[PDB]
Design a protein around this ligand. Structure first.
Ligand code: HEM
Ligand SMILES: CCSc1ccc(C(=O)O)cc1
Ligand SMILES: [Cl-]
Ligand SMILES: [Mg+2]
Length: 393
């Protein structure tokens, strides 16, 4: 009753161009079985949204990667928030929700916006740049570690650790195993910076520790929660900003609309998150035998969700493959949906918005002028290099 497919969603062939295969996964049925990895898969918007919003049936405490924590040991201690279900998930979630709250965004917006303006003016003096290394990567690295309260020493481990985290969600292919095997130096750096004395007072990490006073988390829980913000938020935001620049170069009419109304910057970034879906895939594990679509999934089975596919499903989106900066983007699952929906979404949107605002006000054209290279990762989509020429407005 359930179609079996041999598509490998963790192959380089898939990463290079997943969209034809995503249609095949969508059109094969509401639920598919991926024989290559012995997991179920859902690729349409309806089922992805349904799974995300049914946490008691499709749980996260057995891991949101391929590996099942009931069967295998986690490569690192499980995340206190991402790999927890209610009620264990709730109070750590509340802490990060307050640390990364709307109120918090007021304290960082001016600095984040000023840095984005300055970065774009710096790049305009160069003309031709790499929009990944010199922009999409450079800008978040220039604001987020400082906002986190990290010391200067050791920040060279941040990008390697982020890449490792998202590769480890995947199957035990080469990308995953090569990342985990010699990852101890990255883990030692991260674990050290999660300790209270190493975090600048007033930053995100120190604020997490400050919540131990309230009874929401214990002191021994706090380092693990800080770790979440050195795991998530970097590569996804980098990839999202890079995709936004790519779309503004490939859809030049949309850059001209953004220039004419820079207040579209926030939605222009949201549309890029839907278009790119920097977090392409992750898993749930069934706690019960379940009827999804017309399929009966057994208990203890891994269920792979295709967020990028859900955000390009023509059953839900008009012209899903077009980048449209005035599209009504509410309802996309690029940030997830339900109880786990990205707790850092306000930080990501802030970085994306102010960068696209700086582009909107300062740049007249963005032209690709060199070979474009893709960045390969088991669960992230994004570019490795994006040579562009920036024309000043
Ligand atoms: C464009 C940027 C981003 C994208 C596409 C993204 C994507 C996601 C997604 C899809 C989830 C849901 C995971 C699940 O349901 O299992 C999630 C959760 C999460 N995100 Fe993000 N994220 C982004 C930025 C950030 C930032 C900037 C931070 C931190 C500053 C962050 C921290 C987290 C954390 C801690 C969770 C776990 C939340 C929970 O389980 O309750 N993310 N993110
Ligand atoms: C799968 C969504 S991206 C993400 C990665 C790691 C964490 C964490 O370490 O808590 C949270 C979210
Ligand atoms: Cl670690
Ligand atoms: Mg300033």
């Amino acid at each position: 009753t359930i179609p079996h497919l041999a598509i490998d969603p963790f192959s380089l062939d898939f990463f290079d161009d997943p969209y034809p295969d995503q249609q095949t996964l969508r059109d094969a049925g509401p639920v598919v079985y991926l024989d290559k990895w012995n997991v179920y898969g859902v690729a349409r918007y309806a089922e992805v949204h349904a799974v995300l919003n049914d946490p008691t049936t499709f749980c996260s405490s057995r891991g949101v990667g391929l590996s099942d924590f009931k069967k295998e040991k986690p490569w690192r201690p499980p995340s206190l928030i991402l790999e927890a279900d209610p009620p264990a998930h709730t109070r750590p979630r509340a802490v990060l929700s307050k640390v990364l709250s709307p109120a918090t965004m007021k304290t960082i917006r001016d600095g984040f916006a000023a840095a984005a303006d300055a970065k774009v003016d710096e790049l305009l003096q160069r003309g031709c740049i790499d929009a990944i290394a010199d922009l999409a990567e450079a800008y978040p690295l220039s604001v987020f570690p400082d906002a986190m309260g990290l010391k200067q020493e050791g920040r060279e481990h941040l990008l390697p650790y982020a890449g490792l985290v998202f590769n480890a969600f995947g199957p035990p292919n080469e990308l995953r195993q090569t990342a985990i095997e010699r990852s101890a130096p990255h883990q030692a750096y991260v674990n050290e910076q999660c300790q209270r004395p190493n975090l600048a007072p007033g930053g995100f990490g120190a604020c997490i520790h400050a919540f131990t006073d309230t009874g929401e988390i214990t002191p021994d829980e706090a380092p693990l929660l800080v770790r979440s913000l050195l795991s998530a938020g970097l590569d996804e935001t980098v990839n999202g900003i890079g995709a936004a620049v790519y779309c503004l170069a490939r859809f030049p009419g949309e850059l001209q609309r953004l220039r004419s109304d820079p207040t579209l910057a926030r939605n222009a970034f949201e549309e890029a998150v839907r278009f790119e879906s920097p977090v392409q895939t992750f898993f749930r594990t069934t706690t019960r035998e379940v009827e999804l679509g017309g399929a009966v999934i057994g208990e203890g089975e891994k269920v792979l969700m295709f967020l990028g596919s859900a955000n390009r499903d023509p059953r839900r989106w008009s012209d899903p493959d077009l980048y449209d900066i005035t599209r009504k983007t509410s309802g996309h699952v690029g940030f997830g949906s339900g109880v786990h929906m990205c707790v850092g979404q306000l930080v990501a949107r802030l970085e994306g918005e102010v960068m696209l605002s700086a582009l909107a006000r300062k740049v007249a054209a963005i032209d690709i002028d060199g070979p474009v290279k893709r960045r390969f990762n088991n669960t992230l989509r994004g570019l490795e290099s994006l040579p562009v020429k920036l024309t000043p407005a």
